Structure formats: C-alpha cells, structure tokens
Amino acid sequence: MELVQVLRRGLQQVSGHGGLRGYLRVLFRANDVRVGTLVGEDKYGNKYYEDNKQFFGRHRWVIYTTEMNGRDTFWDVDGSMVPPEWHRWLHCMTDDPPTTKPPTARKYIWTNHKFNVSGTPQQYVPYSTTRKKIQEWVPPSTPYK
Template sequence: MELVQVLKRRLQQVTGHGGLQGLLWVFFRANDIRLGTLVGEDKYGNKYYEDNKQFFGRHRWVIYTTKMNGKNTFWDVDGSMVPPEWHRFKCYPFFPVFYP
C-alpha cells in the first residue's frame, strides 16, 4: 500500500511541474524536486510553496522568477530576491502563513 502512495506522489511531482521537461528544469535550478501548495506570488513573480509533509525547516520554499528588473536570473538565484513582505514567510517558519 505504501508503494502505491510513493508512486502516486512521484507522478504528482512530474505533472505538477509541467511534465518531464519542467521537472528537469526545476531539478537543474534547485537541485531538489518538491511538491507543495502554492501559498502566493510576490510582485517580482517569485512563487512561495509550503508542504507540511516535509520536516520542519524544509517545509517552505521559493521558486525564483527567471526575469527580474530586466535581467535574466535563471541561474543567478539569490536570497536577496525575496522582497521584505515575504521575508517572514521564508525565515520564520514557526509563524503561520502570512499573506501580504
């Protein structure tokens, strides 16, 4: 029974990232493949996710935008790309989800 749940979750990861190509792009950028609930998106296009099935401290993450201020940021991701209103979501995971 647990094998079925694992396979189902892996299939959700592939389809949740837009197919195999999208899954590979996320893996190459972040070196990790996660599945979670979209919590929100900031003014730059960064997407914030949460998955409470992950252990504490890794249950919230950011998928950074590929273009910011006219610059291609596909490979140049940086923690400073998170605006102040979303900083609490990422750095203080023991607070409830904050929607700016």
C-alpha cells in the same frame, strides 16, 4: 504495497510540475522535485510554496523568478531576491503570509526590492555626509598693490 505507492507518487512529482519539461526545469533550477501548495506570488515573479508535512526547515520554500530588475535569474539566484514583506514568512518568523496578512503601507517604503547591488555598477560608495568645517579667505581680485 508501499513500494508500488512509492513508485507511483514519483509520477505525481512529474505531473505536478507542469509535465516533464517543468519537471526538469525545477530539477535543474531549484534542485528539488517536491511539490507543494502555492502559498503565493510576489510582483517580481518568485513563487512561494508551503507544505506543512515537511519537517521544520523545509516546510516553506521559493522558486525564484526568471527575471528581476533587468537581470536574468534563470540560472543564478540568491537569497536577496526575497521581497521584504515575504522574507518574514519564508524564514519562519511568522505564520502569516503577506497574502493573508499584508504589511502596513507607508509612503517611504520602496516599491521595487533591489537585490544585493554589490558588483554591479549600482554599488554603494561611502562618503562624508557633512559639509566643510574650516572656510578659506578667498583673496580679493583687485591688484591694488
């Protein structure tokens, strides 16, 4: 009996992911075919699912967006593509998703979560943030002598 139901829900796996094409899309992209309730979505396109039935660690997950900040992320993705508001919910540091509890807004907070900028020409180059200490004599211009 459970064999038949087990064979069956493997078809709900392909039905949930928008048919066969989406099934191979998620299989080749996120390496999983499991379905889950759409907890939310961010402005960059990442979709955020949760399934409390899964054991602690895989109860929440992301399908990363195809495109972010002028970069194709269909095939290459990383953990820095998580916006700061949702990084709390994803890492099980809270049970309140940004959809229900949104983080407090302030002027200085960014509006475009840049990913790891290492490698790309938008890297970070250390430099001294202080001015000079010893000044020079700046000799006069009149020949005089």
